[PDB]
Design a protein around this ligand. Structure first.
Ligand SMILES: Nc1ncnc2c1ncn2[C@@H]1O[C@H](COP(=O)(O)OP(=O)(O)O)[C@@H](O)[C@H]1O
Ligand SMILES: Nc1ncnc2c1ncn2[C@@H]1O[C@H](COP(=O)(O)OP(=O)(O)O)[C@@H](O)[C@H]1O
Ligand SMILES: Nc1ncnc2c1ncn2[C@@H]1O[C@H](COP(=O)(O)OP(=O)(O)O)[C@@H](O)[C@H]1O
Lengths: 234, 442, 443, 28, 436, 66
């Protein structure tokens, strides 16, 4: 019992056998070369890159070269020891701000203090059981273990599973590299996965790369059960 | 807990022949309404039929919600009782049909039977094998009792269980395989050489004897709304508690109904019906009534109890007056229980029961004058005056409420008619409907 | 034993081969003209040629309109899709009622498919990944290939995994000593469980044990799937199931209804056309039922006037119980059954007629048969004269209190004193209105 | 005859041993 | 392609006109309404010339009199590669888009840009593949031989086409189209070899083909808005596209047209039941109709001296007079008995229904007595009654049984007026009981 | 209300002691962690769990910190 695969892939018309991911959407959005060349990619006859610089770097209000007073004001507000952090916040997308977030230190002489709800949160990280703060802060896992939810079955499965719509442009490789980079971004896909243990042992001991230089992995949320991790039912 | 408005009622007070006693379980009077409520209680406990709407109608301060909550108290455990107000349907996240669908599906119960294995013993060896980043965690565990000795394999959630409230190879733990509960019973080894890192005062227990693994058939009650919330998306358990479940699709409910029918056929689960109570149902749009009109005709529908203190009045969303604030389609398919006003002795017994619930001792003449005020004015004012007269009673340092305390409470706090008369005698002092007020006293 | 609620004694329309309805057969009493019209429309939807045909069931309250729609649903069988709906369901806070109208319009067109699945399955024997030459170059993955050794009945296959396949291998947490299920259409992976080739009782993670799968490792199986056009539309609107970044990031986001454009619907219709031209799919038109159509307002009616002219819309059934009622959303115009005349001109109205005393008596008799109840003849006559006196539904819902009050007296039959006790205990609409008129303080 | 145990294979991974008298932490 | 069971206007294949713009009595599935058909042909030549823009035409008449039939005839006779958007009056009251923004989207969806580009493709018949690999797979060499019905070749491949051929696995006997520039491998199927099924291609292996592209203004507006990708064309969450991006698109289409790399094709926007719009929509429409990149707007209405929505007064056709000054009005009329008979005969031939002549005359009589749509709806029911008694031809009593079973408007109003005591009135009063 | 048993002060020494029987294929196996602490009119060395040193390394605890 599986969802219907709304996809076209390489099928066989029947010392190893190599299988490569080749799932594509049957719906194809066909786009001409002229729009992609003359409006997305910069060239000599357009001003995409110049306008991008003039809007993102030169007239950026968090530029320390021009708004040093504002940077000092926001540094006194937040207590963050780097003045270039506002520039790096404002000029990268959301998930890039998500997956390399580091818990850096902030100075005491500031105004962003510890909220009582945040202090209530921060008390119960490594607190064990039968503590009053931990037991008052662990309602949901108590309800998980009391209602026997870790051994429940799955009743609903989706009917159709489909990949995203493949955009094709005939006669250009740059669009193909850009689309492959957007669909299979190695930083995000490494954030949504994990490194094998023998591979990690080859990183750390046999190659000398330290632990904190690793790419960030294991940000995928765990499913409720082992049964809820998939859509194919035996 | 705290003494509430309906804290003096534990049950309905009915005989084996469904004859209500004149004074039982906090109920006095209302014999016909209590008889009909006992009939509807036996109907719900039977569970054979579904989708019947019950109406409780009468004047204000009569015993509608008291009767409904008494039905809930006599209903007992593992039977759902969704008691919502009529105003909760109007929301900015869910539609009225979707909110009423969730309120319907909260009152149908699924009882699933599960098999468990219980492991308790003295632990010998724990080996935990983690990766460098701590992601891939696997391990071995060695558990023992006085007669047997076994070595198990550990998973990720088991290792996270042993990591919290750490076991130090000589504690006696309890493991439920189907639940994943790690319960450290105590410690039996009593190791003399302990490092000065933890302030453990773990009680001395004895290492358990006999069979290490025992089977147990367990049961638990769940309802359909959390089932289709769990099956709705990836993080349905969090959306169960945040309430962030926006407009679950119809295929989810269809497949959940098919799976529930399969579970009933296989004998794994059985459906336990409950009661949905909609307090003050006259504040609902006619769209809500038209949805209830069809949703009462499904097999997956509970017994709906609706209470209305309104007379003939205009239905919301329309421009015509209707009996009980409801259209005639809902009154076509509902049986109505009518409540009646009280007498002197019933109000006196209600005040006696409430005073015994509030542990306030009342004299005879104070009780007579309180019943006199509750006959002249409403019942709720005489109910609320009791704690005030009690506070006045320990203000003069004696634990008995006499005439003078209730008279002082009567002078201090005003009625509805007294406040109406005192406003209407001094209409220039207050802001009127036209917004004109005389502020200066000259 | 079983559960019933105001229905399920209706099993079908109950006609002959020539379409002539009997008097009492199949849970139906009377309504011969309406049942014959329902048999005609059942044969019409089974003809599978017409699109955009609409009727309206006109009648009073408690006359058997929704019962006719349920009888149509059971006469068509479970295979033809049936979409029950209420006129108040069209109002959503998430999305406009126009998109909800074509949401339910595309929910009522069925489709089969015959889909080939390329399956690799077996027991994993070894898990050896190999590393890259420079992993911290920023671009490219940490690993390059993963060798998997699959063993099944009469065969053993060794495969070289892509990293993208290895992500969906790792996410279901496989290990050596497991049984897996590679599904090559989407890259979806099912962890079947631990094999029984190793030990059983030495686990602590409530796992279940699966034997070695039969057949070769590489397979091609045929799977018959039933599907609607709406599921294809919402799968292409929110794409989940692939092995890209967006496919994971859609499965974790909140699902929300969106205004589906016509362009995706035309592309989906072209894909379904190319599926039906290759002899794989077969199109199943269905029935959409809207109860209480009078609660629809003027813009939904005006859009339905366009929605009925599409070349894909199914047979739509409406029902109402208003005589001379103004349309919702307008101020002055009055139209029959709360339905504007420009939509009335596209309908085929079916009258529903009220019943007589004997019809109420045999309906109460069959109802007491269905809920497994025994009634005396005098009590049945009293119930029939009450059903003529007040309403059919009040007598229909009063019989379960007679069952309870007969049970509580250690009796099996229902007597007239028992019916009088149920009379005194529970009230009806007319007595409650008379109490409301002769009331002191809005009682 | 008895049925053989699943293979335990942990390469390049840290280890924590908790004996009766002393604890270990085999790291890298 | 383009699946369709039977539609209400499926029998209309275009406007039946001669070369002098004169209407035939019966051509391409349309009868009657000669002057309206002539006016719609004038509109068709107006669009086909394309030298003018932003002209609004209102089509008004009695209900069930050839309005949407006229619009479907115009859309069918326009043909492909011309944008045609058919919206209703209630499709603009969105909760995430505003009304004027939705009207701007519907306006810009009806103007297309014609782009001609070429792309060289290789398509042939795969005879034999050779794959040589090393132990680590670092260096791969391969031979591909491939053919048409005319030629033969063998190709030496680099490692990337080797990887792209072991992906989407090509075997012997396969027909593959290969793109050299982007490396896209498409499997057209297997050829004719018994030992799906397609034919072996002929002619040259390395074909250079040109394609004619069509893209609306709205597609470029969605793409050039950097906040969302091209998935918003399918999901529908465009979400209030700004004005400076529209200014860039409007300048760049003129820059493309002056260099000759693109041409602009105008289309027709059809707003059916235009009287359900609000006054704020019409107020946007008067200024939107004077743009250079505005299509020809066809609007249909049937109301007569009705209250305009959002106001408190009454206007002819539900539209205020400032909008009506910018419109030229085509008026339709009622049908005679001969035209109703011809329409019913055409709908009988369309739905594969065989009739008796006296039954056709009965249908014509009850069509000129009650409605055209009622007679066009009974003709499908009577066929099912005819198959219920196992005969092909529909006779008079077959139509009579459907007339008895299925009700019309005025008869139903008459029994509502007769038995209104058993129905719910405007005041919510009903009687259910049959006694007293 | 709650009771907290705390240890705090400036770190005096931080030496993870090795085991008397190290395991093969590994490096610096730890039997216990010895940390010395000093405060106002008080100095006391500690004897810790071996797993605590991993949290010491994650929290970046050098010598001379509080
Ligand atoms: N029979 C009874 N037993 C106990 N308390 C009662 C009884 N009847 C009325 N009351 C009290 O009177 C009040 C009744 O008001 P409420 O419960 O809101 O229902 P309604 O609005 O229908 O009168 C309740 O606070 C309840 O405590
Ligand atoms: N012909 C019939 N035979 C048996 N029961 C009927 C018949 N017609 C109506 N009923 C009963 O009357 C009730 C109302 O029917 P339904 O169509 O659901 O609502 P309404 O008639 O008000 O639209 C149903 O519960 C059904 O049991
Ligand atoms: N000239 C015509 N030729 C063929 N069919 C027509 C003609 N005029 C009207 N009809 C039929 O009359 C019906 C109503 O036409 P339509 O224009 O859709 O309604 P309205 O006039 O209310 O917009 C349609 O089903 C169409 O088939």
């Amino acid at each position: 019992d599986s969802p219907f695969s709304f996809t076209t892939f390489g099928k066989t018309t029947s010392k190893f056998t190599d299988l490569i991911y080749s799932s594509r959407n049957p719906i194809k959005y066909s786009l001409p070369r002229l729009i992609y060349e003359d409006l997305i990619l910069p060239n000599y006859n357009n001003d995409v890159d110049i306008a991008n610089k003039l809007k993102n770097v030169k007239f950026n209000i968090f530029n320390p070269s021009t708004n040093y007073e504002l940077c000092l004001f926001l540094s006194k507000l937040t207590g963050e020891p780097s003045l270039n952090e506002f520039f790096r916040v404002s000029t990268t997308p959301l998930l890039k701000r998500v997956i390399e977030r580091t818990n850096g230190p902030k100075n005491t002489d500031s105004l962003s203090f510890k909220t009582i709800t945040q202090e209530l949160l921060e008390v119960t990280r490594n607190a064990p059981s039968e503590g009053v703060m931990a037991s008052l802060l662990n309602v949901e896992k108590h309800a998980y273990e009391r209602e026997y939810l870790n051994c429940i079955q799955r009743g609903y499965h989706p009917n159709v599973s489909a990949p995203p719509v493949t955009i094709e442009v005939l006669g250009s490789s740059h669009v193909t590299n850009s689309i492959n980079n957007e669909l299979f971004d190695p930083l995000i896909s490494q954030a949504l996965s994990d490194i094998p243990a023998i591979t990690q042992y080859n990183m750390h001991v046999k190659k000398g790369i330290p632990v904190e230089d690793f790419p960030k992995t294991g940000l995928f949320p765990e499913p409720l059960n082992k049964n809820f991790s998939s859509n194919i039912s035996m | 807990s705290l003494i509430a408005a309906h804290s003096h009622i534990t049950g309905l007070g009915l005989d084996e022949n469904l004859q209500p006693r004149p004074t039982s379980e906090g109920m006095v009077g209302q014999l016909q309404a209590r008889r009909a409520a006992g009939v509807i209680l036996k109907m719900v406990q039977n569970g054979t039929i579904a989708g019947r709407a019950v109406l409780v109608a009468g004047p204000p301060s009569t015993g509608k919600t008291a009767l409904a909550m008494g039905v809930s108290q006599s209903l007992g455990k593992d039977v759902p009782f969704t008691a919502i107000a009529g105003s909760e349907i109007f929301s900015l996240e869910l539609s009225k049909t979707e909110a009423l669908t969730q309120a319907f599906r909260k009152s149908i119960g699924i009882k699933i039977k599960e098999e468990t294995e219980l492991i308790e013993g003295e632990v010998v060896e724990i080996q935990i094998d983690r990766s460098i980043t701590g992601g891939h965690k696997q391990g071995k565990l060695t558990i023992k009792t006085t007669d047997m000795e076994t070595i198990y394999e550990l998973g990720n959630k088991m290792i996270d269980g042993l990591t919290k409230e750490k076991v130090l190879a000589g504690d006696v733990i309890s493991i439920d395989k189907a639940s994943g509960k790690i319960t450290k019973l105590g410690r039996s080894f009593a190791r003399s050489r302990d490092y000065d890192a933890m302030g453990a005062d773990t009680r001395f227990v004895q290492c358990p004897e006999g069979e290490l693994q025992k089977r147990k058939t367990v049961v638990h009650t769940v309802s359909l709304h959390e089932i289709d919330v769990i099956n709705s998306r990836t993080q349905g358990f969090l959306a169960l508690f945040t309430g962030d479940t926006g407009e679950i699709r119809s295929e989810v409910r269809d497949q959940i109904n098919t799976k529930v029918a399969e579970w009933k056929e296989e004998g794994k689960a059985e459906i336990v019906p409950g009661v949905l109570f909609i307090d003050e149902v006259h504040m609902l749009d006619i769209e809500c009534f038209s949805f209830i009109n069809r949703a009462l005709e499904d097999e997956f529908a509970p017994i709906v109890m609706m209470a209305t203190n309104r007379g003939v009045s205009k239905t919301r969303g329309t421009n015509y007056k209707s009996p009980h604030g409801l259209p005639l389609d809902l009154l076509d398919r509902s049986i109505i229980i009518t409540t009646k006003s009280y007498n002197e002795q019933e109000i006196k017994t209600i005040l006696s029961i409430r005073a015994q619930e509030e542990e306030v001792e009342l004299s005879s003449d104070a009780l007579d004058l309180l019943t006199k005020t509750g006959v002249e004015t409403s019942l709720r004012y005489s109910s609320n005056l009791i704690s005030v007269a009690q506070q006045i009673a320990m203000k003069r340092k004696n634990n008995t409420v006499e005439v003078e305390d209730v008279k002082r409470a009567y002078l201090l706090f005003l009625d509805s008619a007294r406040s109406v008369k005192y406003v209407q005698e001094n209409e220039s002092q207050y802001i009127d409907d036209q917004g004109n007020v005389q502020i200066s006293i000259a | 034993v079983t559960r019933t609620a105001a229905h399920t004694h209706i099993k079908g329309l109950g006609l002959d081969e020539s379409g002539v309805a009997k008097r009492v057969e199949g849970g139906f009493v009377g309504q011969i003209e309406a049942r014959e019209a329902c048999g005609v429309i059942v044969d019409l939807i089974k003809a599978k040629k017409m699109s955009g045909r609409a009727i309206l069931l006109a009648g009073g309250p408690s006359t058997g309109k929704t019962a006719l729609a349920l009888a149509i649903s059971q006469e068509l069988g479970p295979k033809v899709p049936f979409c029950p709906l209420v006129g108040s369901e069209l109002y959503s806070v998430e999305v406009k009622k126009t998109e909800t109208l074509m949401e339910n319009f595309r929910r009522a067109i069925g489709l089969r498919i015959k889909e080939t699945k390329e399956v690799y399955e077996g027991e994993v024997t070894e898990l050896t990944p190999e590393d890259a030459e420079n992993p911290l170059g920023g671009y490219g993955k940490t690993i390059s290939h993963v060798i998997v050794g699959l063993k099944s009945a009469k065969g053993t296959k060794t495969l070289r995994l892509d990293p993208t396949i290895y992500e969906s291998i790792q996410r279901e947490k496989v290990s050596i000593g497991d049984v897996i299920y590679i599904e090559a259409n989407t890259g979806a992976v099912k962890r079947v469980g631990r094999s029984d080739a190793y030990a059983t009782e030495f686990d602590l993670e409530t796992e279940e044990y699966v034997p070695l799968p039969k057949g070769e490792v590489h397979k091609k199986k045929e799977i018959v799937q039933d599907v609607t056009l709406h599921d294809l539309d919402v799968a292409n609107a929110r794409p989940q199931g692939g092995q890209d970044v967006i496919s994971m990031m859609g499965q974790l986001l909140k699902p929300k209804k969106t205004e589906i454009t016509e362009k995706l619907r035309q592309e989906v219709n072209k894909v379904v056309a190319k599926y039906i031209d290759q002899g794989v799919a077969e199109l199943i038109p269905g029935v959409l039922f809207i109860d209480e159509v009078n609660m629809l307002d003027i813009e939904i009616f005006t859009y339905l006037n366009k929605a009925l002219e599409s070349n894909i819309a199914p047979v739509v059934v409406l029902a109402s119980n208003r005589g001379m009622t103004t349309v919702r959303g307008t101020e002055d115009v009055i139209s029959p059954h709360g339905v504007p005349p420009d939509l009335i001109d596209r309908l085929l109205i079916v009258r529903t007629l009220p019943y007589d005393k004997d019809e109420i008596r045999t309906i109460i008799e069959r109802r007491a048969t269905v809920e497994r109840l025994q009634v005396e003849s005098s009590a049945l006559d009293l119930l029939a004269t009450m059903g003529t006196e007040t309403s059919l539904r009040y007598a229909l819902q009063l019989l379960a209190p007679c069952g309870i009050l007969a049970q509580t007296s250690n009796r099996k039959e229902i007597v007239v004193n028992d019916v009088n006790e149920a009379k005194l205990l529970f009230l009806d609409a007319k007595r409650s209105t008379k109490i409301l008129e002769t009331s002191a303080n809005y009682l | 005859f008895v049925k053989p145990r699943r293979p335990y294979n942990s390469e390049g991974m840290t280890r924590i041993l908790r004996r009766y008298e002393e604890d270990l932490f085999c790291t890298f």
